[PDB]
Amino acid sequence: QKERLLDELTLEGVARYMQSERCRRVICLVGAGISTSAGIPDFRSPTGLYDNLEKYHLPYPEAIFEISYFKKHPEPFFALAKELYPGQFKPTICHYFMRLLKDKGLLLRCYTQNIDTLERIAGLEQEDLVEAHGTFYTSHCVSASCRHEYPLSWMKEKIFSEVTPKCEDCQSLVKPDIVFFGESLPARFFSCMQSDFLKVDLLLVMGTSLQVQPFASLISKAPLSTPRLLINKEKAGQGGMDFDSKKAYRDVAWLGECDQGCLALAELLGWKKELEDLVRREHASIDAQ
């Protein structure tokens, strides 16, 4: 049933719960909002991709991320990829908060909708991650009989030379290992979902509007007593999220920047110094190349 585990529906209450013996396994669900401070735009933000796709003359915005349209007309996607590719990938304070969760032995799994690989770079291992919508890191030829793999460097050279990536062997289109709209999510998503959520003690949802399915429905996969904290610029997910009704008993919305939310939560736990050290050290290591 609906056991009440938080004393109060606040970030403070969440911290107090996290400090209790009951909280052993945390699952993070994250989206584009945790990477916007790194310089990568999201979908919906009033800066968002969906507000700046006019120049591509699409039948509709989401078409640029739809598999059928991509296969017929890959050019807009790769043009957008040329424009959006950051000079360098650095993880945000949020990513490193998840890394810190890993180091504290609290992180059961991070489910990510993002394709920027910043979770890996932040130091989360493949075991710690479920990359629900794939990754830009590796790419594959679309031919079923060939399925040739291509590294990020090859793809970046293709993209920056404004040449549509074609397989050097079978000449088929080469597509980043991203799950486009209309494609199936990886099996790992469903298997991991079937195993992890029966033992999750806390759901931490960060930087997502919870619009894309079936990822959003993950929030309904948690036990009814499992507290769920949203750190996001606006409320989302309303077995959906219930922050404000009289029946609210386990859901908390902290509204603001993800980095600031993670800093605040870290502070409440006495982890702020640790987090800041982690971020600075890792950033320095990355800059040192």
Partner: peptide
């Protein structure tokens, strides 16, 4: 409601 099946 966008969908990746």
């Amino acid at each position: 409601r966008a969908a990746x099946t």
